[PDB]
């Protein structure tokens, strides 16, 4: 069989649309029938090649692809024909070292990453370890569900590591993709939100989402402000694609407040180190989750307390969706549609 | 009435040992007669006035005096004279405070810090809160207990809040007048130590206090080393704060590991946001610590697990010490010893 | 000089409406003129003079006292007079024990208990330790945050002592003045609610608060139904005055999960060891809650996340309401109020 | 084709030592070749059938066999023939539930058991989980590092869910099979370790293994003793789950202090409520252990910081050894020994 799939094939370079092979399920593994596909920014840092660790080229990008298991290998069980599943940025880790024998199977040292070191979902179908898929939930559409595999999970899993607990203030810097999601989890893990950013529409977005407070790092320095509105925030999670975020944070905080890191613009940050002895301050940084993390996450979507802000593309507009992510002009999440 | 004291009355100036009152205790304070007193860094950075807020002048340094509590105010139960006790950096908490509350006066934006916002130990006399004062193990002489007040606390603190346990691998960075003592705070809490330095007599000293391992930094990249040898450190204590060390120490550290910083640097250093979101690092601020985490450290001492290396001068030799210590000549700790 | 109070002159004899001196504040002392005060099951033990420490005679009881700062004794700085105050169980803790310096005020074997071992608030006036009394919300009238300063405290700390997290399912055992405030304060804290009592109007107090499941223990089985309709909780908090329950509430969870028990009935409570062991479960005593868990407390009831479901009689009437807490009815909290 | 094992083929019977075809590994499974096989109580209760839900007959019994892999089946990765492995009592695990996801396999309701529900150690052959199976180390010989499989592990992660940290005080209850590995795992993990035992011989070998206090309970009693010796310990290891046992340890512990159950003791133990109530105390079952907690007990055996107790016995006189244990006349612990 024959489908169609999104490659980049040099760095910095338009995706091609090309007509590529179907991939076909080894042993333990399982094909998935895509049905819609979340763009995640680090679709950008990889396609543009930002980051130490390259992606092997060509590739399809995509960890945000959820769909129908359409095929199985041998010595298959934990899903079948018919499952509705995603395909997230952990492929798949050994099962057997430290990390993954202690239930931190997204620090595996083995592990393979969807759309990046293996092909991902911008394509009609994609190959993947049924050990490490989501497993979704009957009551919520393909379209809505996607942005749960990555910007979900991840910012759930961060929150989680923030050592914030009901009551408590929590910054969110960044309202985009996993940033306007991020502040609904916070919500409904009891916590009161302030949100950052650089754009008054995001912000808007933010307030819609359940913010309480919320301020433009263009207009005024936002840790400056943190500080004075609500007295420092116990904890911060950042999912700016800016370095210059990632040191403002730092300011954002209450003596013995925590800071998580899920943003990966290339570079280093200016840290404030004598505040931080000081002060007692942590920086965490938070990789995806766990496969506990995102059953987790999408429970929270199954309940009904966490939706996706989402506009949808076709496959074919990819490099037009990367423009205007990369440009800021993006609200939420663009999800690639396969339906019908 | 009078005393002699060392007294900084100008920033950067030598210090004057005068003849002063000797200060008298009211409702809720003590008086300790000083029988030996610890000097470090940190005093320098006091009588220096280089911290971005400096003490008041004239002042009278020292937090690390140790004696006898030879005079109590009124309504005065945690202690009687003739009790052995030190008056730690930490003078004073507001007792009411977020912080205070929670147990964590160590951050208590009211805090009042000895031998730099209220007068310390470098005189005969001190006026203390008892509230604050360490409790000093019977069995421990004056001059050795002393920097158990400051070198000993502070590490132990630190090695906590590296979130390690009994039979993990801790990095200790710096085998200087902190590091040296970490070394042995860490072997007696379970840990397996791996020493790292550019001197080699301070590897060889680290490997006689318990250091399993011992990298020279000088001749072999302790990163790439450490992380083949024992797959990275669980935990990475950095008592000498560079951007070198901090560097390193990202990369010694195993995946989800955490490093404390028990120093205080001038300038912001640059962080790597790529290698601490990606292997989910945990950078952490400490230094000094609690009521509670001064008792336990003293215990250490007084069970004879932890022995700072020790010397002494005199009083009046206080700035001779200073220059000792600007130098880096200083081995261990010098210690004032009021002794007759 | 002369106050009207319910004293206990002798156990097991209802309860006198006596004049009495008014209490003077010495040093370090406050008065509070007393507003309202909410009437705990625990009230009753004191008066019966029932368990195995006993109050001494005579004295009055009330650990839930709200007024105004009436009176200020010296070296007072935590409050004024004005000041809007309340005097819970914790009357006092000798501030630096073990217990103390860890932030675990309430296991202070130095601790005085108001309306136990001191005098308490069911009377016009009482006197109080200023550094542990409660500073109430402006925004809360008296008589419905009485019961926080007991009820809400109490099982907003074993809440969190349960080690339960946002989408978890927590079972809340008793819904009497504990009870019905524990259902509001689980779902502030994200967490999905389960309700048990032995009288379903109890029951549907615990649903219209929140709770999403309940079940009565007279009508069945309750932890055999809730194995069946949740899967078993992951954690339970029994507020229960019955020593069955507590046996059953063992048999509520999933493996690994654990009961927090806050109910003081007399005797033991039967327990299946084996089942215990074999499932990784955990049972824990929670003891209301240190000053910090009771201003975090008094938070939720001022931003409206909690409402004790309050009923108020006069002081003269303490005895009839007695007799209908003994008999199981009333309905949520009563508060005396002392409005004019 | 054929081998020796000793199979139970009546509860209660004398096991019968018989020819049995050898076990051959399928796909994802190994063959492993026993050299030396652990035995200890809960063999005894599996040949007895005593326990809730009985093996299936017939069975071989022993969940602490060590030996060499000696054949491979398909698709196995985590070990190769010739390896050093132990086969212990958590077979294998679903891999997919709720516990397994969050590496907590010890809590898998789908588990299987070693030497219980599958066949076991007690042949020259056996057929194992490779995912689950113990990778020893290399230092230390198959004899001594059997018990480490079943008592090591129990005792090691009982102790780390006492919740305490070095310098702490920790009771061991009971100084037998278990007890006196506890003591080692306690001081390595820098606990300061009570012993507690009726008996002066077991009391004497706790402390020659470092216990700082020993108390005989048949002359004085231990919780008030310790109460004012140490003023109660900060976690107490029951080893021993006697009903005199556990309410002591309810005695001995401090308050807010964590008892943790170390055994499967039958019928319902009464728990004092005020006791547990007002102290704060957690009470917490446990046995053995995770992989992860299986491959950091061993450890300590590698590096000689714990050392079990054994005697070795041939397969065929294995009814003489279950006579011994039946009659308390075993010290330490037993292990076959199929070594040429
Ligand atoms: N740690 C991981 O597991 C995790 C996983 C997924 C996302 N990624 C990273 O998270 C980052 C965000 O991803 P996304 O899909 O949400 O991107 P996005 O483009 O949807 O969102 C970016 C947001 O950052 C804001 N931004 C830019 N400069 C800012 C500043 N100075 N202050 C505050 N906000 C600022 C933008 O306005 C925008 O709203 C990316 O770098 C991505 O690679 C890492
Ligand atoms: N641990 C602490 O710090 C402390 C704090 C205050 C209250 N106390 C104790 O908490 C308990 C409750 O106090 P309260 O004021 O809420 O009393 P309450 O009379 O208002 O509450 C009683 C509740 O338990 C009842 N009950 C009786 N049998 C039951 C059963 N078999 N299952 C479930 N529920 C059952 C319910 O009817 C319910 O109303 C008392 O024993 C009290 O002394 C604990
Ligand atoms: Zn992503
Ligand atoms: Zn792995
Ligand atoms: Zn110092
Ligand atoms: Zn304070
Ligand atoms: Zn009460
Ligand atoms: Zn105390
Ligand atoms: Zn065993
Ligand atoms: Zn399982």
């Known amino acids: 069989a024959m489908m169609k799939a999104a490659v980049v094939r040099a760095f910095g370079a338009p995706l091609t649309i090309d007509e590529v092979p179907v991939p076909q399920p080894g042993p333990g593994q399982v094909q998935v029938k895509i049905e819609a596909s979340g763009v995640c920014h680090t679709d950008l840092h990889a396609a543009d090649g930002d980051w130490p660790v390259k992606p092997t080229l060509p590739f399809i990008p995509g960890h945000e692809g959820v769909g129908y298991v359409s095929a199985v290998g041998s010595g298959v069980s934990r899903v079948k024909e018919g499952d509705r599943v995603g395909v997230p940025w952990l492929y798949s880790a050994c099962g057997y070292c430290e990390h993954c024998l202690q239930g931190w199977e997204t620090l595996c040292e083995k592990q393979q990453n969807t759309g990046y070191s293996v092909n991902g979902g911008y394509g009609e179908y994609v190959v993947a370890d049924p050990n490490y898929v989501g497993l979704l939930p009957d009551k919520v559409g393909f379209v809505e569900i996607a942005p749960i595999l990555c910007a979900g999970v991840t910012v759930y899993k961060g929150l989680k590591v923030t050592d914030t607990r009901p009551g408590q203030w929590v910054v969110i810097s960044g309202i985009g993709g996993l940033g306007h999601v991020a502040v609904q989890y916070a919500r409904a893990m009891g916590l009161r939100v302030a949100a950052v950013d650089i754009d008054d529409a995001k912000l808007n977005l933010a307030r819609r989402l359940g913010a309480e407070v919320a301020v433009n790092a263009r207009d005024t320095d936002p840790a ?50 004598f505040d931080v002895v000081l002060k007692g301050i942590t920086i965490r940084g938070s990789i995806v989750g766990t496969r506990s993390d995102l059953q987790e996450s999408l429970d929270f979507a199954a309940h009904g307390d966490v939706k996706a802000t989402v506009s949808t593309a076709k496959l074919d507009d990819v490099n037009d969706v990367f423009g205007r992510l990369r440009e800021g002009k993006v609200e939420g999440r663009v999800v690639l549609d396969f339906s019908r």
């Open 224 to 273: 400056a402000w943190l500080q004075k509105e609500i007295g420092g925030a116990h904890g911060v999670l950042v999912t700016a694609v800016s370095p210059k975020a990632f040191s403002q944070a730092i300011g954002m905080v209450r003596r013995g407040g925590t800071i998580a890191l899920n943003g990966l613009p290339p570079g280093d940050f200016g840290t404030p180190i």
